[PDB]
Design a protein around this ligand. Structure first.
Ligand code: NAG
Ligand code: NAG
Ligand code: NAG
Ligand code: CA
Ligand code: CA
Ligand code: CA
Ligand code: CA
Ligand code: CA
Ligand code: CA
Ligand code: CA
Ligand code: CA
Ligand code: CA
Ligand code: CA
Ligand code: CA
Ligand code: CA
Lengths: 276, 542, 266, 271
């Protein structure tokens, strides 16, 4: 009821635990499963959605609440990834040559970002603190940056000639650019086919989990070189058959949801902080 | 009020800072003249070509240019003359090679934001013959755009390079007085400064690896225009000599006393005459003001040049007078005495221990009057107790306060002011104001007193009866303890006590020269204190 | 917060990324200005009012109809300059209704399921290239009233070629829906309350906005301004000069994580 | 101006409506189309007799005609003690009529603006630039501390920002605290730096037809309709004048005496 203020909450130890709410959340929540196209191709069964829905029902979920969203690959899925379910699970196939792209995708979807628009043609942009990044997504986003000194003259580049700009992104579907803080940069972005936004990492996004299918511990969802945390929402699975992968996902849905939580930014109690 | 003297000395260093830039640089009625002027000017170009076959130019630079025209102002056809020059120019250069063949420009001048454009302006109107004594002057002008034009270079071989582009906006920033040198007379003129701002047209030279260069080259800065025009208004306030309210000179080319005298000779009599009209209690009130530099030099109705340098001119004269040298000698003597336990023999002490305040010196000595040794010692000491006055080592109000108050109340009233009169009248006043002044030091309900005139007195505070003066104790007291100026010196104090029996508190305050008791006694029209303060004021006779 | 949301706030009566601004203007405004550097001038004029350099943003939209296709609210404060057209009144209102309020919308699969509006806060918001909403109310037996569930030509049309439309039907009644799902999408939305970080300035015209479906009320909130105009430069100058007053009418505490004009729940 | 101490127990004085009707003058301003449609040379006398029935002595009511809103806006001189301006509504002139209201429903303290030599700025929200004439085409160039222009060149008026074209009256509001260079056609226009002091209580404006569109305040967050802004639907001008005459007491009730001590030069029609 008091939505604009952060009031302290006094809890008492020894307060009896409430019964398990897993059944109630399963009955009153929606699960989205994100898988690549090759998964469906290998499975080769036009009715596999119904089979998985029935298996989830055997596991508890009502047979109208599990959604299956298909994406071509990591690169395409990274353009405006919209996750609307109460609980989102993303099966991301591992490629040894796409480590940075997978890390960027996980950073984008495993964390909450507050993004403001960017007019590279109008303003010189600066990153204030470590939580600030430049997230750009599009069909082909190429970003070059020219740092400017206190006199607004470029460093190692000329503001007039974009050829001297330092290239940081080339033909990227998604890229999270981190430059030196407290320095103004002139930006050259292929805005005609990609959008760049100035974003802050508010914190974890608890309703999105990523299962890396058949790789190693390579995701780095933090730009700090000294930290490469492996949160509970990033799992790894060895695989040969996608049917086995989906059976493992179905059978351990309890644990997968346990690793996740309702989106803190969502729901009524988050009203008037950022959203709802 | 004495603080002013100190501050002048304290600030004297800035005087040197002035001289540098200066040597790098090279009654009255107020009448207003706001005039809508149209400065029409132009540049000139010096194109000196080098030897050889003509492929090389030694210089292509700016040159001051004169212009004459006529324009209408309030229905008056006014003839105007202007002279435009430039300063702070960038010497670019083109060097096609070491061969005589290659295009080479040794040095070509381009005016950029770091440059300035100066424009002298004059007309035969009234406003420009009243500007000999100027109170204030300020001009506003609409900015103008000066674009560089084409200029082809005379090569007999191959393509002809062309100097196109280049543009700067002139924005008015400052107007001052200046002089135009004619054949047989000299004209007062208004010199306007213009700051440059680079503009979009970028100048480039064809047949060259030169492009996207910004500024205004000297090649063809007029771009074929007959003149460059700025329209604006200048406000002038002129000080015309007038001795009556019904006349007002059309022109102020009158001679003033300082146009003919550099050493004020008769203004001393003017000051000594001004001394008559000085009130007493109000003079004390003014003397208690901590007269700082701003307070001292703010109320003078100066000219445009005089206000610009009043403080530093006064201070330049100030750090040469006998007062400044006495302060310097005192400081050097103290530093030398502290700097070496070697020459306690050279200095002779009239106290228990050696001190620069307590040393006897030349004193050529006066056999005219039978003089006691104690008198000479006390006079020599008091002549340094004056530097104690001007070293913040005093307790009550000092004679320097009265001197400063008299100086202020006289300079404001004195109609004789000029950039050379206020110097040497502040300094010489500080030197010659109240020459014979006494000091007293209190210790264990006993007062010792000395005077520059050689009169010394020891007495008791509770009852003013004289005591055998104990030299070598007055000296030890006066070297360290607070020294009190004797505004109400012993003789006046005893007269007052005998005739106007004063209380213990009143005597206490009078001894320490408390302003409150002084002013209360003055307000009662007490003849003795009024007489003493009259003697003090008449001593401020310059 | 959430664990202290349902707690009291006691106060005494005797006691005594920075903000970003977005300007949404029609393209005809920029055409009338005819300057290619006006954005920089307005940014500096705003900076006179205290907005840092890279804070104010200018977003262009072709017209009211096109802007209504899934509008996006980017900045902390969103001032929308809406040109008035007497022929587009409802559309303007619809946009305001979708922009000055917070909505909670769920997917609608019209082909398989009937739908009803539970209460007065429930509407059906549809957006896209062109919507043609045709409605067939049913009865307790699930037979259409004045319509045939099989024959869609008898359906009652409530929208035609709409880029945005908010449909309000009789509550407690099931409706079969025919929507051009190919060219536009419909959602069951609930109005939560005001969206305090968006203000709408109507350039020209008269007060015609109606952001409430109820016919008995047409409230003009502090975030609904109106100005007479002749030159767009004057419009932008008055927007810049009185930006303090415009922000005073708004609150920075309604900027969701995403720029969408409605929360979406599956 | 002195403190005025009064008692809440004092008795109401009798109606002063008759006295003020006897000792004051009323001015009615109407468009020329009103007299055209009425088509009667004696209509002034008819309205005068009707007003006399309402109480106004013969000759106290003065009828003044203006060609149209645009023409009336050129230095509108309001003579009588009580002024009522019948302003026909045109959907295309919503700003202009509003401007006219803003000019005549408020008190303005104005001083000349010599733009060609001086740089001008607006100090506060009450400050505006009122330009009046046959054709007022004002272009503005905002400046900065270095005197340069923002998106404009002080030496090239073509780059100045267009804020008004061929205007008989225009109230210009720019960003406060910023110097601007102004280029307006001084031959057919005069621009004045003005401060609005407060409402002008002896001037009421009756909008004949349309809807409430007047905005006498530059602030976008306020569009107040004071009691001196009336709005009546119409189809015949005789009905308009009859309703003005019949409710004259109500109209004057909404108005108060000017109360301002002026310095300008304007004739008045007073009794
Ligand atoms: C919780 O579980 C216990 C034991 O299974 C049961 O008795 C109780 O009714 C359940 N519900 C609540 C609200 O305690
Ligand atoms: C004369 O001068 C004395 C001191 O020099 C002063 O006290 C006096 O007021 C002056 N004038 C008259 C009229 O007494
Ligand atoms: C006011 O009106 C009352 C009642 O009509 C009448 O008796 C009285 O004489 C009038 N005048 C004054 C001054 O009260
Ligand atoms: Ca990438
Ligand atoms: Ca480079
Ligand atoms: Ca950074
Ligand atoms: Ca890391
Ligand atoms: Ca619509
Ligand atoms: Ca039907
Ligand atoms: Ca309904
Ligand atoms: Ca309504
Ligand atoms: Ca107008
Ligand atoms: Ca422009
Ligand atoms: Ca303003
Ligand atoms: Ca308004």
């Amino acid at each position: 009821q008091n939505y604009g203020i952060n009031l302290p909450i006094t809890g008492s130890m020894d307060t009896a635990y409430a019964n398990s709410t897993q059944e109630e959340t399963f009955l009153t929540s929606t699960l989205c499963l994100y898988y690549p196209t090759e998964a469906a191709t290998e499975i080769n069964d036009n009715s596999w959605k119904d089979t998985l829905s029935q298996l989830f029902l055997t596991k508890g979920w009502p047979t109208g609440s599990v959604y299956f969203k298909e994406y071509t690959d990591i690169a395409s899925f990274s353009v405006d990834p919209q996750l609307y379910c109460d609980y989102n699970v993303v099966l991301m196939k591992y490629d040894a040559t796409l480590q940075l792209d997978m890390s960027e995708l996980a950073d984008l979807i495993l964390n909450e970002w507050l993004c403001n628009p960017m007019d590279i043609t109008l303003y010189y942009y600066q990153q204030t603190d470590e939580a600030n990044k430049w997230i750009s997504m599009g069909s082909s986003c190429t970003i070059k940056v020219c740092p400017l000194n206190t006199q607004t003259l470029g460093i190692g580049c000329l503001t007039t000639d974009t050829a001297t700009f330092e290239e940081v992104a080339t033909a990227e579907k998604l890229v999270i650019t981190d430059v030196v803080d407290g320095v103004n940069h002139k930006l050259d972005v292929t805005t005609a086919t990609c959008t760049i936004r100035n974003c802050k990492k508010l914190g974890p996004r608890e309703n999105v989990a990523v299962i890396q299918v058949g790789g190693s511990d390579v995701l780095d969802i933090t730009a700090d070189p000294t930290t490469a945390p492996q949160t509970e929402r990033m799992m790894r699975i060895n695989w040969k058959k996608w049917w086995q992968v989906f059976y493992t996902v179905v059978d351990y849905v309890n644990q997968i949801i346990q690793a996740m939580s309702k989106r803190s930014r969502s729901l009524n109690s988050a009203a008037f902080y950022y959203r709802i | 009020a004495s603080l002013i003297y100190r501050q002048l000395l304290t600030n004297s260093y800035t005087v040197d800072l002035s001289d540098e830039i200066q040597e790098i640089g090279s009654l009255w009625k107020e009448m207003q003249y706001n005039r809508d002027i149209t400065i029409r000017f132009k540049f000139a170009s010096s194109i000196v070509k080098s030897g050889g076959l003509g492929y090389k130019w030694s210089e292509i630079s700016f040159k001051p240019a004169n212009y004459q025209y006529t324009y209408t102002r309030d229905g008056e056809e006014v003839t105007a003359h202007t002279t435009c020059s430039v300063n702070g120019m960038n010497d670019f250069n083109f060097n096609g090679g070491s061969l005589p063949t290659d295009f080479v420009i040794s040095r070509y001048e381009v005016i950029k934001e770091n440059s300035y454009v100066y424009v002298d302006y004059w007309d035969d109107s009234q406003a420009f013959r009243n500007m000999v004594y100027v109170r204030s002057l300020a001009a506003n002008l609409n900015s103008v755009i000066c674009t560089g034009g084409d200029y082809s270079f005379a090569l007999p071989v191959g393509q002809w390079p062309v100097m196109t582009g280049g543009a700067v906006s002139l924005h008015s920033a400052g107007v001052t007085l200046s002089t135009q040198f004619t054949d047989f007379v000299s004209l007062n003129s208004l010199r306007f400064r213009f700051r440059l701002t680079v503009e979009e047209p970028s100048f480039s030279i064809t047949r060259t690896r030169v492009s996207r260069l910004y500024g205004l080259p000297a090649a063809n800065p007029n771009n074929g225009k007959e003149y460059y025009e700025v329209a604006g208004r200048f406000s002038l306030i002129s000080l015309v000599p007038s001795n009556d309210d019904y006349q007002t000179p059309i022109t102020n080319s009158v001679t003033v006393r300082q146009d003919l005298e550099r050493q004020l000779g008769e203004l001393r009599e003017e000051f000594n005459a001004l001394s008559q009209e000085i009130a007493m209690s109000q003079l004390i009130d003014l003397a208690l003001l901590p007269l700082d530099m701003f307070s001292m030099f703010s109320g003078i109705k100066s000219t445009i040049d005089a206000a610009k340098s009043m403080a530093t001119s006064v201070m330049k004269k100030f750090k040469k007078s006998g007062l400044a040298n006495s302060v310097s000698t005192l400081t050097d003597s103290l530093s030398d005495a502290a700097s070496s336990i070697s020459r306690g023999a050279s200095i002779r002490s009239v106290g228990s221990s050696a001190s620069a305040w307590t040393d006897v010196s030349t004193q050529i000595t006066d056999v005219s009057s039978s003089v006691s040794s104690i008198s000479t010692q006390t006079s020599t000491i008091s002549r340094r107790l004056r530097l104690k006055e001007m070293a913040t080592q005093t307790e009550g109000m000092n004679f320097d306060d009265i001197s400063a108050a008299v100086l202020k109340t006289k300079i404001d009233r004195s109609t004789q002011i000029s950039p050379n009169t206020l110097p040497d009248i502040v300094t010489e006043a500080s030197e010659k104001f109240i020459p014979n002044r006494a000091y007293r030091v209190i210790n264990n309900d006993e007062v010792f007193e000395a005077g520059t005139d050689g009169r010394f007195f020891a007495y008791r505070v509770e009852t003013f009866d004289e005591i055998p003066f104990d030299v070598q104790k007055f000296a030890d007291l006066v070297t360290d303890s607070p020294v009190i100026s004797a505004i109400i010196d012993f003789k006046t104090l005893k007269n007052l006590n005998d005739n106007y029996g004063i209380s213990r508190q009143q005597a206490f305050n009078l001894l320490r020269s408390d302003p409150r008791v002084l002013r209360e006694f003055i307000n009662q029209d007490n003849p003795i204190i009024r007489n003493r303060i009259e003697q003090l004021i008449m001593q401020c006779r310059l």
